[PDB]
Design a protein around this ligand. Structure first.
Ligand SMILES: Nc1ncnc2c1ncn2[C@@H]1O[C@H](CSCC[C@H](N)C(=O)O)[C@@H](O)[C@H]1O
Lengths: 265, 265
């Protein structure tokens, strides 16, 4: 009669909360999805071992098209857990699943966990200053999405920071790197000429948030575009005007140039 | 040798991540602050019991004025942890404490935890649509804060949602309710008259996020301003233009008026 949406957190199998782990252990059935994002610092086997339960992985179609046929039936007469990377319901499509639960006569509860949306606070940038968020998607065929460029423009215009989620081919386990993201943005700039993202733009890269050793780097595009930020996942941030306290953190903690103190404050 | 900033999560002691617990358990000294937020479902004793260490609570003055005199000295010869509600670097000024650690020759690490900033996903509103955030501060003396009103206006103009952190007076044990926040906004509206926040404005309230049964309610101010949302902490949200799926969730899960389903595109 109960469905639990449990977040797995940021990077490895220990990023789940104590509450989530204990609840998952008591569930009769445990499902999971790894298409909204991945858990780069662990494996399905390591998560299964920690939970002590067999974990049935569901694809995007399994969830979007057949959630009520695969998960809800068992949730009708048993305690069922649905695991997702990060914090449940941050991914736009998750919320709706709670409605399906209601219509199936199944109760649902949400067990939160850290999300990159909030973890970016480790960059030293004030969370309240983050504006609208966006995703940089790989272009392909004759399709070249550029909406994320406009998000940056509108946020920076109001002195706000822009969080850019980078594309990921979950099934193929291919992660877009911050370098690839910067290359694309310069390419979009060259096409839109809005002076939004250039070699002189200050950016912040956060890699492997959740790990005890994430890479946090800040600097101008011209200097970071070919820097090695380590293994995925990577997140790119284009900050707006900085509070001096933000700038000092970037310099002291993220190795940013002293120049940002006079150019971006 | 090291200093750990470990988040405790949204509501109770089990909201800490497994990573944070295992690390805290092995630290020599454990400090904490409980003035940046309110964990309404636990107590110091329960947290102490879970971690198996005596937790020394620090006041805002202890931290802001003497963090380097109380915490850092020990971190030079021991493994020290600093616990905080939610995520240690979200809507707090704790990030700057990492600079003090550095300048003191102390390596610091951050362990994230569920944050109210991302937990808002449970309201059904798309996280990427949230714009700048703000804090509704208690007026004091002849000083009546109003900056949060302009944040809502700017976000609403762009079709973005606004997350409003509500004030807290930890030592005085005062936790601002959504009702009180709504009252203050109506007053600011009377002054500025920007038509930003009125009796007809649609709002969303989230109370005690993190608990298994948080209060999630959506409706018009005139109808919710006197409603009982349960014990604090509370958060208030002023949605921008809604996607149909957001409206459906607000109606099905947050009990909003069915008329909002009819979106004005
Ligand atoms: N569990 C909860 N439920 C509802 N609101 C919460 C909450 N936790 C925090 N808040 C809101 O956020 C304010 C504190 S600001 C600090 C937030 C904390 N660092 C975090 O990451 O969660 C509270 O006064 C309240 O307005």
């Amino acid at each position: 009669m109960v469905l639990y949406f449990i977040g797995l957190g940021l990077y490895d199998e220990r990023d789940i909360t104590v509450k989530g782990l204990e609840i998952a252990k008591k569930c009769d059935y445990v499902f999971a999805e790894f298409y909204t994002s991945l858990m780069a610092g662990t494996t399905l086997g390591r998560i299964q071992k920690l939970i002590g339960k067999e974990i049935r992985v569901l694809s995007r179609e399994d969830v979007e098209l057949n959630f009520e046929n695969i998960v809800l039936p068992l949730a009708k007469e048993n305690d069922v857990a649905f695991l997702t990377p990060g914090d449940p319901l941050v991914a736009t499509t998750h919320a709706e699943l709670r409605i399906r639960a209601k219509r199936a006569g199944v109760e649902s509860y949400v067990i939160h966990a850290p999300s990159i949306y909030s973890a970016v606070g480790i960059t030293g940038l004030h969370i309240y200053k983050f504006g609208k968020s966006a995703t940089v998607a790989y272009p392909e065929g004759n399709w070249f999405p550029t909406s994320y460029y406009d998000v940056i423009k509108e946020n920076a215009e109001r002195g706000l920071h822009t969080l850019l989620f980078l594309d990921i081919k979950a099934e193929k386990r291919m992660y877009m790197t911050a370098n690839e993201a910067m290359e694309l943005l310069l390419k979009v700039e060259d096409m839109k000429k809005g002076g939004v993202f250039t070699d002189d733009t200050l950016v912040v890269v956060l890699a492997r948030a959740g790990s005890l050793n994430p890479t946090i780097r800040a600097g101008y595009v011209k200097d970071l575009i070919r820097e090695d930020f380590g293994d995925p996942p990577h997140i790119l941030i284009v900050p707006g005007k900085l509070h001096i306290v933000e700038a000092e953190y970037l310099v002291e903690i993220a190795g940013a140039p002293r120049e940002i103190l006079r150019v971006n404050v």
